Design a protein around this ligand. Sequence first.
Ligand SMILES: *[C@@H]1O[C@H](CO)[C@@H](O[C@@H]2O[C@H](CO)[C@@H](O[C@@H]3O[C@H](CO)[C@@H](O)[C@H](O[C@H]4O[C@H](CO)[C@@H](O)[C@H](O)[C@@H]4O)[C@@H]3O)[C@H](O)[C@H]2NC(C)=O)[C@H](O)[C@H]1NC(C)=O
Ligand SMILES: *[C@@H]1O[C@H](CO)[C@@H](O[C@@H]2O[C@H](CO)[C@@H](O[C@@H]3O[C@H](CO)[C@@H](O)[C@H](O[C@H]4O[C@H](CO)[C@@H](O)[C@H](O)[C@@H]4O)[C@@H]3O)[C@H](O)[C@H]2NC(C)=O)[C@H](O)[C@H]1NC(C)=O
Ligand SMILES: *[C@@H]1O[C@H](CO)[C@@H](O[C@@H]2O[C@H](CO)[C@@H](O[C@@H]3O[C@H](CO)[C@@H](O)[C@H](O)[C@@H]3O)[C@H](O)[C@H]2NC(C)=O)[C@H](O)[C@H]1NC(C)=O
Ligand SMILES: *[C@@H]1O[C@H](CO)[C@@H](O[C@@H]2O[C@H](CO)[C@@H](O[C@@H]3O[C@H](CO)[C@@H](O)[C@H](O)[C@@H]3O)[C@H](O)[C@H]2NC(C)=O)[C@H](O)[C@H]1NC(C)=O
Ligand SMILES: *[C@@H]1O[C@H](CO[C@@H]2O[C@@H](C)[C@@H](O)[C@@H](O)[C@@H]2O)[C@@H](O[C@@H]2O[C@H](CO)[C@@H](O)[C@H](O)[C@H]2NC(C)=O)[C@H](O)[C@H]1NC(C)=O
Ligand SMILES: *[C@@H]1O[C@H](CO[C@@H]2O[C@@H](C)[C@@H](O)[C@@H](O)[C@@H]2O)[C@@H](O[C@@H]2O[C@H](CO)[C@@H](O)[C@H](O)[C@H]2NC(C)=O)[C@H](O)[C@H]1NC(C)=O
Ligand SMILES: O=C(N[C@@H](CCCCNC(=O)c1ccc(I)cc1)C(=O)O)N[C@@H](Cc1ccco1)C(=O)O
Ligand SMILES: O=C(N[C@@H](CCCCNC(=O)c1ccc(I)cc1)C(=O)O)N[C@@H](Cc1ccco1)C(=O)O
Ligand SMILES: *[C@@H]1O[C@H](CO)[C@@H](O[C@@H]2O[C@H](CO)[C@@H](O)[C@H](O)[C@H]2NC(C)=O)[C@H](O)[C@H]1NC(C)=O
Ligand SMILES: *[C@@H]1O[C@H](CO)[C@@H](O[C@@H]2O[C@H](CO)[C@@H](O)[C@H](O)[C@H]2NC(C)=O)[C@H](O)[C@H]1NC(C)=O
Ligand SMILES: *[C@@H]1O[C@H](CO)[C@@H](O)[C@H](O)[C@H]1NC(C)=O
Ligand SMILES: *[C@@H]1O[C@H](CO)[C@@H](O)[C@H](O)[C@H]1NC(C)=O
Ligand SMILES: *[C@@H]1O[C@H](CO)[C@@H](O)[C@H](O)[C@H]1NC(C)=O
Ligand SMILES: *[C@@H]1O[C@H](CO)[C@@H](O)[C@H](O)[C@H]1NC(C)=O
Ligand SMILES: *[C@@H]1O[C@H](CO)[C@@H](O)[C@H](O)[C@H]1NC(C)=O
Ligand SMILES: *[C@@H]1O[C@H](CO)[C@@H](O)[C@H](O)[C@H]1NC(C)=O
Ligand SMILES: [Ca+2]
Ligand SMILES: [Ca+2]
Ligand SMILES: [Cl-]
Ligand SMILES: [Cl-]
Ligand SMILES: [Zn+2]
Ligand SMILES: [Zn+2]
Ligand SMILES: [Zn+2]
Ligand SMILES: [Zn+2]
Lengths: 694, 694
Amino acid sequence: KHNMKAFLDELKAENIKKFLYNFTQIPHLAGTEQNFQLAKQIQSQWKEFGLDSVELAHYDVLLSYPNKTHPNYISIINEDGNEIFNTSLFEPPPPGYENVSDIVPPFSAFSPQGMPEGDLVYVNYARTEDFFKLERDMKINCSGKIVIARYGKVFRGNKVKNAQLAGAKGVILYSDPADYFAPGVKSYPDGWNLPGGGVQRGNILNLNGAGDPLTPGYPANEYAYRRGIAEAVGLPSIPVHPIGYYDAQKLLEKMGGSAPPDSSWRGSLKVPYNVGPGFTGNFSTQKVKMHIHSTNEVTRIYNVIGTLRGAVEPDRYVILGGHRDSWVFGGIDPQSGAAVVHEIVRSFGTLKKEGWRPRRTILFASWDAEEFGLLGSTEWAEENSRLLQERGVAYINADSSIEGNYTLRVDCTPLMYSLVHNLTKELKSPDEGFEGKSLYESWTKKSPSPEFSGMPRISKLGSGNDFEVFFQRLGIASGRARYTKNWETNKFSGYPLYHSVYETYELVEKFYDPMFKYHLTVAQVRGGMVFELANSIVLPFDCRDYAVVLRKYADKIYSISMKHPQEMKTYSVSFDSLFSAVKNFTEIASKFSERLQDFSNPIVLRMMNDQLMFLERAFIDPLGLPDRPFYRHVIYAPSSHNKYAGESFPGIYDALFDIESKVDPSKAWGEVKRQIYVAAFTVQAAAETLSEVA
Amino acid sequence: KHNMKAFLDELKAENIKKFLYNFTQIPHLAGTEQNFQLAKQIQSQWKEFGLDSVELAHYDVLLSYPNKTHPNYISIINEDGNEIFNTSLFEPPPPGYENVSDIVPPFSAFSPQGMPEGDLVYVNYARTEDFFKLERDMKINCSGKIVIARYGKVFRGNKVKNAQLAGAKGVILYSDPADYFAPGVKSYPDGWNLPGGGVQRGNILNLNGAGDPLTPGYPANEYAYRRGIAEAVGLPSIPVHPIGYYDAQKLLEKMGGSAPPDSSWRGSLKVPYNVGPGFTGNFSTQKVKMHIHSTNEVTRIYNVIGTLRGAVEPDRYVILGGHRDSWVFGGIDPQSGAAVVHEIVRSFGTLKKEGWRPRRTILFASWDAEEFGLLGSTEWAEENSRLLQERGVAYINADSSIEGNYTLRVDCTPLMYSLVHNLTKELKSPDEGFEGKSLYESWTKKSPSPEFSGMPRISKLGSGNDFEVFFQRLGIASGRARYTKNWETNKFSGYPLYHSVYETYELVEKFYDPMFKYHLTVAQVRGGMVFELANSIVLPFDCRDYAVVLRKYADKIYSISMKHPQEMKTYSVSFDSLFSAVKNFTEIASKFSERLQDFSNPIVLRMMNDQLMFLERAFIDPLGLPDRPFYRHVIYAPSSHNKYAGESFPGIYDALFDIESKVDPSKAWGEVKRQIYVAAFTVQAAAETLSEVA
Ligand SMILES: *[C@@H]1O[C@H](CO)[C@@H](O[C@@H]2O[C@H](CO)[C@@H](O[C@@H]3O[C@H](CO)[C@@H](O)[C@H](O[C@H]4O[C@H](CO)[C@@H](O)[C@H](O)[C@@H]4O)[C@@H]3O)[C@H](O)[C@H]2NC(C)=O)[C@H](O)[C@H]1NC(C)=O
Ligand SMILES: *[C@@H]1O[C@H](CO)[C@@H](O[C@@H]2O[C@H](CO)[C@@H](O[C@@H]3O[C@H](CO)[C@@H](O)[C@H](O[C@H]4O[C@H](CO)[C@@H](O)[C@H](O)[C@@H]4O)[C@@H]3O)[C@H](O)[C@H]2NC(C)=O)[C@H](O)[C@H]1NC(C)=O
Ligand SMILES: *[C@@H]1O[C@H](CO)[C@@H](O[C@@H]2O[C@H](CO)[C@@H](O[C@@H]3O[C@H](CO)[C@@H](O)[C@H](O)[C@@H]3O)[C@H](O)[C@H]2NC(C)=O)[C@H](O)[C@H]1NC(C)=O
Ligand SMILES: *[C@@H]1O[C@H](CO)[C@@H](O[C@@H]2O[C@H](CO)[C@@H](O[C@@H]3O[C@H](CO)[C@@H](O)[C@H](O)[C@@H]3O)[C@H](O)[C@H]2NC(C)=O)[C@H](O)[C@H]1NC(C)=O
Ligand SMILES: *[C@@H]1O[C@H](CO[C@@H]2O[C@@H](C)[C@@H](O)[C@@H](O)[C@@H]2O)[C@@H](O[C@@H]2O[C@H](CO)[C@@H](O)[C@H](O)[C@H]2NC(C)=O)[C@H](O)[C@H]1NC(C)=O
Ligand SMILES: *[C@@H]1O[C@H](CO[C@@H]2O[C@@H](C)[C@@H](O)[C@@H](O)[C@@H]2O)[C@@H](O[C@@H]2O[C@H](CO)[C@@H](O)[C@H](O)[C@H]2NC(C)=O)[C@H](O)[C@H]1NC(C)=O
Ligand SMILES: O=C(N[C@@H](CCCCNC(=O)c1ccc(I)cc1)C(=O)O)N[C@@H](Cc1ccco1)C(=O)O
Ligand SMILES: O=C(N[C@@H](CCCCNC(=O)c1ccc(I)cc1)C(=O)O)N[C@@H](Cc1ccco1)C(=O)O
Ligand SMILES: *[C@@H]1O[C@H](CO)[C@@H](O[C@@H]2O[C@H](CO)[C@@H](O)[C@H](O)[C@H]2NC(C)=O)[C@H](O)[C@H]1NC(C)=O
Ligand SMILES: *[C@@H]1O[C@H](CO)[C@@H](O[C@@H]2O[C@H](CO)[C@@H](O)[C@H](O)[C@H]2NC(C)=O)[C@H](O)[C@H]1NC(C)=O
Ligand SMILES: *[C@@H]1O[C@H](CO)[C@@H](O)[C@H](O)[C@H]1NC(C)=O
Ligand SMILES: *[C@@H]1O[C@H](CO)[C@@H](O)[C@H](O)[C@H]1NC(C)=O
Ligand SMILES: *[C@@H]1O[C@H](CO)[C@@H](O)[C@H](O)[C@H]1NC(C)=O
Ligand SMILES: *[C@@H]1O[C@H](CO)[C@@H](O)[C@H](O)[C@H]1NC(C)=O
Ligand SMILES: *[C@@H]1O[C@H](CO)[C@@H](O)[C@H](O)[C@H]1NC(C)=O
Ligand SMILES: *[C@@H]1O[C@H](CO)[C@@H](O)[C@H](O)[C@H]1NC(C)=O
Ligand SMILES: [Ca+2]
Ligand SMILES: [Ca+2]
Ligand SMILES: [Cl-]
Ligand SMILES: [Cl-]
Ligand SMILES: [Zn+2]
Ligand SMILES: [Zn+2]
Ligand SMILES: [Zn+2]
Ligand SMILES: [Zn+2]
């Protein structure tokens, strides 16, 4: 038989291992020849594996690279203008790779050029609350200063935006051992910790879902009209550069001015973590000078798009996508995901060669330039948005399969919760101590839901990966799953060697997953989801799970507002419409579920499958969220303070955020009430798509 | 049998006559008690007639009314401040109606209040070209003047916007006998011409598709957040008032300053048509003073929505809608349309009582507050936009059925051209001299297409009626058809008694259509279209007709640009992408048509019907047109100079319009190139929705 079990049994840990090795021998940076040749290899192999069609879709997008003959670095400069300390020009390469040539040195992609020189201010993680503490409580002014911030907690592009708005003339980002060195484990190559010369690469854009900075709204094809660089979307306005903790210590050790305000501001280096501005008495005449000479350049990128045509509903698409471009070797990010996608395609292709086809079409995607701001997935979705919004059932992401070995981590729409619970109940746990137990059992024990007992935690979707355009812009049900660590306060920081030259095949094979059993478990979860979405007769979406979370999110946003009861009385701020809409959604969803269970009629089936598919699409507002036109989902958006985190009722949340500091409270509370109306209307409108159709 | 012929044979001229009489005995102004009672009557009768459900959908929208105890009027005022001439406070009521009480006096809906006093400038029809002629050629400055313009040629809201941008402090609109008095026919009540005391009412908004000024984007329901009046969408900023030609003559006869520039500026009154500013020598110290005291008021409105559920595809909607609110009695506008809709519902209901149901659901709508800017249809479409865009097959409008007795007039999407040609070939001509001939034959003879011989003229959709939100915002295939006059240069001016108190049942029954045979023919065309759209197995849309017109429109926009060959060389302005997209659309449409003819399989059928239904939807840009976010169709939009007219490739057309007067030609031509890219991309994307789906 050709059922899910046949699909899952065909997946092999050894094939994932072979593919990971094959994908991680040389760098695959977006826009380079090496990454194009890998695209061509994947296209060939996907054809060999049995897909019906495999094409490259290319776009010409803005990328950013350092200048090979004018390197980026930071100095401490004395009063005479002598540079008395320089940061490193490259990461010491790992054993056996000291002769690879095109390793991009650490840089912050899309930094502008400049040579600012000034006094340092240390800003902890440069979060919104860290800048509030500095400016409002400590009365430290960042205007015209160079800020130094530790990586961790939030997306680095939020740090840079926060620093810009504080008036900084430059930003230095560094990896503190408190966040990137787990106690009792050795540095690479002898363990999985970050060495003091290691550096986290990464883009610092604030695109808000736009994709290529030069072509927001439209694919960057051959005839595209491009904005001038001056009007580009999302580019930072001050220079930025990342460094390791050896270099950081040299910059921080001389810092004077004010003491850190409390211990949550101190990392693990042997320095005071003084906030500054500037250095202590003897060194008060020294400054810090940045030298950034990176260039933005329009460059071709290539997505590989494979199709497996559905036997019954070929005009319904289930998409499995993950990226292929990496900062250097991409041992975990993304090749641990891409190797899993490759084995999934191979398994589906094996069933196809035996005469099986899925009910619905499955599309497989190897995205390019994810690391430069989701550019490949976003441009392709802009080009195909009409097909996707009328035909897209679901998107399953597949970036890194492992970021640890402790338990499963899942973020997805409420519509997929029941599908995930059911699938993980049928899969074996790979975990030591849980042999013979289901993955659901181990995951639930190690990652319990805060709300419901005997249930695992599943988080909200924000941004940070290639599902962003499908879910936040187009309203296609989306999910992602990976194996993760037991390190709660680090859930947005990345594993220690994230975006460093040390993320290699050897890292994975020696320290993360020697038997590739976590990779296999993740392949079964991602592949199993895709199989069910593409083959179930009734789409495996449960609208009642949306009703449950909408009530939770309504209670949550109400409680935030209720911290200001006098203003709610004065401006007559009522959440009654929103609770009414949620109650209506609950009632209608319950009746729809009864009809779904209680209807031979393929028109009623498809009519009902269309109601399930368009339910996610009903939460899209075509006017978008305030000043973020490409974030259109009214229930979820990437947090305005941390792109990696999803926020619920984001329009209301942002209207209430720091509202007590607004200078026209009438206007601020007016905007809260406007966002309550937009949310109540959208919840009711979504509920009405589940009513009887006539 | 229950086929189209059974449907059409059930329609009776005598029933339309009875309904028209019933609908036109008292005024039915939007927001009044009388119009609510008519809504309730229609809902009851639609239930009686056999519809499955009939509901009222109500909204609270901004309306505008004169002040009953502070009337609007215009004076000529002497240097002492004595008002030596006053315009009329009301139209002399027609015979037998001199005792109806709630006849709204002539006013311009949404005029602000004011009492401006100044010198007059006559601006012909106040079109964009009339203001160019005045300011650029004649060097007459309108700043701080009161403008007087004749009605006709373009929507009166465009006149007022043009006057505002010229710096006028007020606008007087009047009906010139050249435009509203056909030679050799008598004034009402003895013929169909406008008497000198008659006045055309009408709104002067420039909403650009927004609907209710206070709630753009969202339905004006019970919890809606409203903009403050200061931020309302579309309201004029200077007072405006309409008058008849008796009053106009008194204002124009004293005009001095410059002679009219040519004879196209002279109407039929016995005046010089001097442009001014101000009056001739002896009267040079007299001024004109307006007194406008109308108020904007949020008021409840009621749509009646009837459903006839489809037997096979109940989740696909064919909509027949027209409005019910009128300025006074609405003898032609809209009750000649509403009476036709009522008889259509009655006929469909008769078939239903015999056990028939249409294949698809049919929705019937009696819209409110159309006269105040399409408010009822727009608010309902904002409330139901998720259902409409995923389920809406087509919208057929049904406002006035007759505006003359000469021949048919049709405006619709290219997707309906073949349906209209085929249907009118099967219908009998009502025209004298064409007995025994088809309607297609008479219509083609009297209204030949400019392009193709042996084909009738069909025009583009812009705005001016309730189809606007379904087509321009949502991208639902839309059409309209009525009987019209032989008076080409008056096609946007209205018939002589348009929006006057004299538009009565007697007008229609004595002078337009005594045997109700034109009404019946129009019922067969509108009803026949709805029947075919709701009952055909394959949707009756021909994508090849879109391919043909896209080439015509591309050639047209190219030829406009080619009036500036030096600039096209300098800024490298190429239409190659657009012609490439159109060529691709033609090729793909041809292959799709072959598959459609050449595919028992209901999934392939519905997949194919979905491709036909979503084809119109593919021309929608979710970013909208420049500064008009609610006009989202890339091929068509209401002309920026005349809301009543449709313009093709409107983004490119507006970028090229008057481009030789722009002060930064680099920037202006940049924007032309951007619009060519958006159009080429959208044509290609629409073409790709017709490709094989996988
Ligand atoms: C949740 O679903 C319910 C349906 O179960 C839906 O209920 C609707 O509530 C609206 C808004 O409250 C009701 O609107 C009323 O409609 C009546 C006529 O039916 C009007 O007369 C009412 O207006 C009068 O009263 C107002 C309130 O005091 C006054 O402001 C107004 O000026 C009038 O005096 C009012 O508009 C509607 O009838 C029901 N529909 C039902 C029960 O079927 C509810 O709105 C949904 N929640 C959301 C957020 O959509
Ligand atoms: C109408 O449909 C046709 C398909 O029949 C579609 O054709 C596509 O045209 C594009 C744009 O011209 C082609 O893009 C080329 O793709 C190749 C690889 O396949 C690239 O190497 C090309 O880039 C090189 O050449 C460029 C042009 O001089 C250089 O600027 C560039 O830097 C490179 O040197 C180029 O991108 C594409 O291959 C075809 N697809 C086909 C034939 O299948 C056409 O675009 C459609 N029209 C519209 C408006 O969409
Ligand atoms: C996850 O798995 C659960 C448990 O299998 C699924 O719920 C179950 O789904 C079936 C099919 O709809 C339900 O069976 C129905 O039961 C009623 C009897 O009341 C009968 O009328 C129908 O003909 C049908 O047999 C079953 O009750 C239900 N079990 C529950 C809710 O506990 C769930 O659907 C799966 N989720 C997915 C696939 O997304
Ligand atoms: C308007 O009426 C015309 C004339 O009836 C319709 O065109 C005709 O449509 C039929 C059905 O698709 C075509 O018949 C087909 O012919 C081919 C033979 O080549 C055969 O393979 C199919 O099985 C089928 O019999 C017919 O050719 C075609 N006539 C034309 C184009 O001249 C047209 O479809 C109607 N438009 C509507 C309903 O929108
Ligand atoms: C820190 O580096 C500066 C700049 O040196 C250049 O860039 C470096 C990162 C590296 O690539 C060098 O080879 C480059 O010369 C050093 O200052 C320079 O010193 C040279 C030689 O003495 C002198 O001719 C240049 O003018 C200097 N340039 C500047 C901008 O000052 C500096 O010595 C280094 N400091 C330390 C402590 O090593
Ligand atoms: C033109 O009308 C003005 C204003 O009259 C008022 O509004 C009119 C339209 C009508 O409703 C009148 O009944 C109102 O009184 C006339 O000027 C007024 O004349 C009255 C009586 O002589 C005097 O007490 C008012 O102060 C005047 N008001 C103003 C604003 O001037 C005027 O006589 C009329 N002109 C002609 C030629 O009939
Ligand atoms: O590197 C990433 N994403 C990495 C982020 C690792 C940091 C941990 N962050 C999480 O958001 C996370 C990880 C797993 C799950 I299941 C849910 C959330 C990833 O999603 O695996 N994206 C790029 C590109 C990008 C585009 C937009 C924002 O970031 C970047 O962060 O530099
Ligand atoms: O009165 C109308 N519409 C009338 C306009 C009569 C003037 C002739 N205009 C045409 O645009 C026309 C008439 C028939 C066809 I088939 C195609 C076009 C109508 O469509 O019958 N609408 C209102 C309300 C409105 C809203 C937005 C703009 O106008 C108005 O013009 O005051
Ligand atoms: C990764 O695997 C691919 C596929 O097996 C290898 O590419 C093949 O290399 C052989 C030997 O040169 C050629 O004969 C084939 O034509 C290639 N197949 C393709 C591109 O589909 C590639 O060598 C491997 N890469 C590494 C680093 O091991
Ligand atoms: C228009 O027609 C309607 C429907 O026939 C008339 O309304 C009916 O009036 C009779 C007599 O008063 C009542 O018994 C019915 O209850 C009404 N039916 C409804 C409202 O559905 C109405 O009188 C006619 N109007 C005019 C102006 O002739
Ligand atoms: C990179 O720097 C080199 C060496 O100084 C310079 O000649 C070249 O212009 C730069 N390349 C750029 C800016 O792309
Ligand atoms: C910070 O410093 C600059 C001048 O150096 C000044 O313009 C700005 O207002 C200061 N802000 C605060 C809060 O002191
Ligand atoms: C794998 O799990 C073991 C046992 O709990 C742990 O000690 C080891 O460090 C894990 N590896 C990683 C990278 O987390
Ligand atoms: C209308 O005018 C009357 C009579 O002068 C006045 O008392 C009232 O305020 C006005 N009504 C309005 C502005 O709605
Ligand atoms: C029209 O008149 C006003 C002043 O009365 C002036 O500001 C404006 O520039 C004038 N325009 C032209 C074109 O003369
Ligand atoms: C009806 O048609 C006749 C004959 O051509 C014409 O003379 C008459 O004026 C028409 N009525 C209207 C309102 O056009
Ligand atoms: Ca783009
Ligand atoms: Ca509205
Ligand atoms: Cl992922
Ligand atoms: Cl109409
Ligand atoms: Zn990644
Ligand atoms: Zn990454
Ligand atoms: Zn009308
Ligand atoms: Zn009208």
